[PDB]
Amino acid sequence: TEEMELYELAQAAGGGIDPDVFKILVDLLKLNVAPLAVFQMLKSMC
Amino acid sequence: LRRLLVWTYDPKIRLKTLAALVDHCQGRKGGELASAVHAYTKTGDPYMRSLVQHILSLVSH
Amino acid sequence: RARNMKDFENQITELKKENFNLKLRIYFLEERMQQ
Amino acid sequence: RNMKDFENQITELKKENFNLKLRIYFLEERMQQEF
Amino acid sequence: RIHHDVNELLSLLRVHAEVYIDLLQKNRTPYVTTTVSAHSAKVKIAEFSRTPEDFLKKYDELKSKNTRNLDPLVYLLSKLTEDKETLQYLQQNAK
Amino acid sequence: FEVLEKWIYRGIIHDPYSEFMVEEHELRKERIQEDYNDKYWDQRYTIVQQQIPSFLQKMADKILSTGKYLNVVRECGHDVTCPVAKEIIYTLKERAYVEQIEKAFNYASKVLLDFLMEEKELVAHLRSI
Numbered sequence: 206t207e208e209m210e211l212y213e214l215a216q217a218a219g220g221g222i223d224p225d226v227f228k229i230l231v232d233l234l235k236l237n238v239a240p241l242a243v244f245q246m247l248k249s250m251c
Numbered sequence: 252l253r254r255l256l257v258w259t260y261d262p263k264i265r266l267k268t269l270a271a272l273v274d275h276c277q278g279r280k281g282g283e284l285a286s287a288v289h290a291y292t293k294t295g296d297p298y299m300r301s302l303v304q305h306i307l308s309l310v311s312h
Numbered sequence: 313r314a315r316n317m318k319d320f321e322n323q324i325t326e327l328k329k330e331n332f333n334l335k336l337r338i339y340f341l342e343e344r345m346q347q
Numbered sequence: 348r349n350m351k352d353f354e355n356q357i358t359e360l361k362k363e364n365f366n367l368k369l370r371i372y373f374l375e376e377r378m379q380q381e382f
Numbered sequence: 383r384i385h386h387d388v389n390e391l392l393s394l395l396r397v398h399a400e401v402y403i404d405l406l407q408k409n410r411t412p413y414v415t416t417t418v419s420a421h422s423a424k425v426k427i428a429e430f431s432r433t434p435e436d437f438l439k440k441y442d443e444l445k446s447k448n449t450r451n452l453d454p455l456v457y458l459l460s461k462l463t464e465d466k467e468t469l470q471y472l473q474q475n476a477k
Numbered sequence: 478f479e480v481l482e483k484w485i486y487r488g489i490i491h492d493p494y495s496e497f498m499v500e501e502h503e504l505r506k507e508r509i510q511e512d513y514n515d516k517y518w519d520q521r522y523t524i525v526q527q528q529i530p531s532f533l534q535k536m537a538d539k540i541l542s543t544g545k546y547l548n549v550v551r552e553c554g555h556d557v558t559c560p561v562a563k564e565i566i567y568t569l570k571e572r573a574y575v576e577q578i579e580k581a582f583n584y585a586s587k588v589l590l591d592f593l594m595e596e597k598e599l600v601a602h603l604r605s606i
């Protein structure tokens with residue numbers, strides 16, 4: 206994580222992920238990804 | 252507007268630009284004033300460019 | 313669901329043009345620096 | 348042949364591209380060391 | 383282009399065929415900015431009312447921060463509807 | 478938009494405070510003639526992705542790729558220029574002034590290959606290989 210928008214937002218309401226995967230998902234917002242596709246690809250395997 | 256403000260505000264727009272700009276252009280002679288006028292030509296302010304062109308051309312001339 | 317039996321042609325030349333290019337080139341991005 | 352061997356080979360060729368992406372992943376992190 | 387660190391490594395980092403097809407399913411375009419969020423998705427934090435003042439106050443501060451990455455988190459605020467299918471793995475990982 | 482105008486219709490980067498979406502650096506020496514690796518999009522010429530508005534980002538690649546065609550053959554021997562020049566300014570619920578970008582890009586493309594295909598002619602030069 207190690208960022209103000211990567212770490213503080215990941216534990217606001219209920220929180221809880223893998224930290225490296227949460228940092229990768231926080232970095233994926235800057236990678237111009239479609240919000241639904243990455244979550245669908247994660248949910249179709251997890 | 253309060254007293255006298257509107258036709259003293261018009262001067263203030265003529266004057267406050269110089270009170271910053273000539274205070275950045277202190278001491279520079281010859282082409283060194285022209286290199287300051289480069290940095291002030293690349294200014295972000297678009298109206299101040301035309302409003303000070305009268306003096307900026309008497310640097311360039 | 314049902315398969316139209318023609319898109320595999322385009323898929324074969326697609327994977328060929330990606331994989332064989334990348335396979336030989338990426339390894340010899342070493343050679344450009346190692347040689 | 349039973350219309351899954353050919354597509355299994357196709358999926359193997361997708362796995363080849365994934366292996367080339369993994370080689371790219373090792374290559375772009377070895378770029379930082381000596382060069 | 384750079385799918386090694388954030389697609390290949392992110393696909394490999396999952397604890398669970400679609401091993402290589404997950405990157406094609408999550409094939410992001412770097413030239414886009416098309417968030418599917420709306421203002422209706424701001425009520426997703428209201429279900430987690432353990433301390434709702436310090437669950438509703440964070441969003442204005444994250445918007446007041448100068449990053450534009452707060453927009454795609456509409457589906458990520460709801461996250462998984464399964465019971466702790468991402469959150470509970472950290473307790474196993476910490477051991 | 479006046480800085481954009483100079484970059485779209487001429488090969489000139491005005492560069493106000495470096496807050497415009499395109500800027501030029503002197504990376505030219507890294508890969509001067511050939512694109513040995515890429516140079517004219519993120520490196521020698523670079524786009525600050527967040528310094529573009531929304532109604533222009535939809536074709537900011539074409540903005541970044543318009544002016545280069547006006548300022549790579551200027552070094553090589555033809556005055557590649559756009560005599561079309563349509564002033565860019567805001568208007569209520571309108572972006573036709575950004576719709577002008579396509580015409581200027583295609584015109585820069587037209588004069589660039591109107592050099593390249595017939596002076597240093599690729600259709601006859603390339604045959605050699």
